[PDB]
Design a binder for this molecule. Structure first.
Ligand SMILES: [Br-]
Ligand SMILES: [Br-]
Ligand SMILES: [Br-]
Length: 289
């Protein structure tokens, strides 16, 4: 299990420990740079917009356009260190994608890591949200919203068919990669309890390289697709890679249960957001109800 965030109250500040290191963070930080889209959506849900001074503005998704005019510190992949320094923040918040930049960021300002543990997603989510809330004295409000998520999970789980199985795939222009439980797409299986066609795909971010022959052999009831063609802006789309007589014979094709998930949620991994996680849960529930 990933080490959680822990915090001791030191009067005007908290001494914070997480899986990357230790930081003294001021109470009520007023100049926050946020590189994780999910936690950015949690700042909105907690009414903390005016604490935010820098976001990855370049390809910000549709549900975070209230932050489109914040100073930019980057994009999905790139970080602008010069901009982050000029903003003179009191806190920087990162997740997994930016852990490679930890030491450089920490030279600028205290740097809090809100990692999502693929083996323990809900426990990491709740830890992340409540840790941010503690900084602002907003635990009450954060617990209410976490309860709302919990209730939506239980509603979705209660409609899941015990005997049907799903496959998760990530498409590129000419490539199909499968993902299973305890992946970064794993909440389908791990949180909502939809069964997997293959519970033994090996852990790791590349997933398993597959073809249509594999899809037919597995014969999934549902296929959840995360089309990376969309985030890059290429012409080939998953519907095309899947448009063949092998895929067409599957239960999922026959029952129109090839589900094209919005990659602005699933590929950008906005699970830390109190509203974006709800949107994702509802996206699955409505695909399988
Ligand atoms: Br820390
Ligand atoms: Br505007
Ligand atoms: Br993964």
């Amino acid at each position: 299990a990933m080490l959680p965030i822990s915090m001791s109250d030191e009067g005007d500040s908290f001494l914070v420990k997480d899986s990357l290191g230790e930081n003294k963070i001021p109470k009520n930080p007023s100049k926050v740079v946020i590189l994780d889209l999910g936690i950015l959506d949690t700042f909105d849900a907690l009414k903390l917009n005016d604490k935010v001074v820098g976001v990855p503005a370049k390809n910000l998704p549709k549900y975070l356009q209230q932050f489109k005019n914040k100073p930019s510190v980057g994009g999905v992949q790139q970080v602008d260190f010069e901009a982050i320094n000029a903003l003179k923040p009191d806190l920087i918040i990162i997740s997994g994608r930016q852990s490679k930049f930890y030491d450089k960021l920490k030279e600028i300002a205290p740097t809090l890591f809100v990692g999502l543990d693929n083996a323990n997603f809900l426990s990491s989510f709740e830890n992340n949200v409540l840790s941010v809330a503690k900084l602002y004295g907003l635990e009450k409000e954060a617990l209410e919203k976490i309860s709302d998520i919990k209730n939506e999970i239980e509603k979705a789980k209660s409609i899941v068919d015990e005997d049907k199985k799903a496959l998760i795939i990530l498409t590129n222009s000419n490539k199909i990669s499968a993902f299973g439980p305890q992946s970064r797409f794993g909440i389908i299986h791990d949180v909502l309890g939809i069964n997997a066609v293959d519970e033994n795909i090996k852990v790791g971010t590349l997933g398993k390289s597959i073809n249509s022959e594999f899809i037919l052999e597995k014969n999934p009831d549902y296929i959840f697709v995360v089309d990376r063609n969309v985030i890059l802006g290429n012409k080939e789309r998953a519907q095309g890679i899947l448009d063949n007589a092998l895929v067409a014979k599957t239960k999922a094709a026959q029952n129109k249960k090839i589900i094209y998930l919005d990659p602005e949620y699933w590929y950008l991994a906005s699970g830390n957001g109190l509203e974006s996680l709800k949107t994702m849960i509802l996206e699955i529930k409505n695909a399988v109800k």
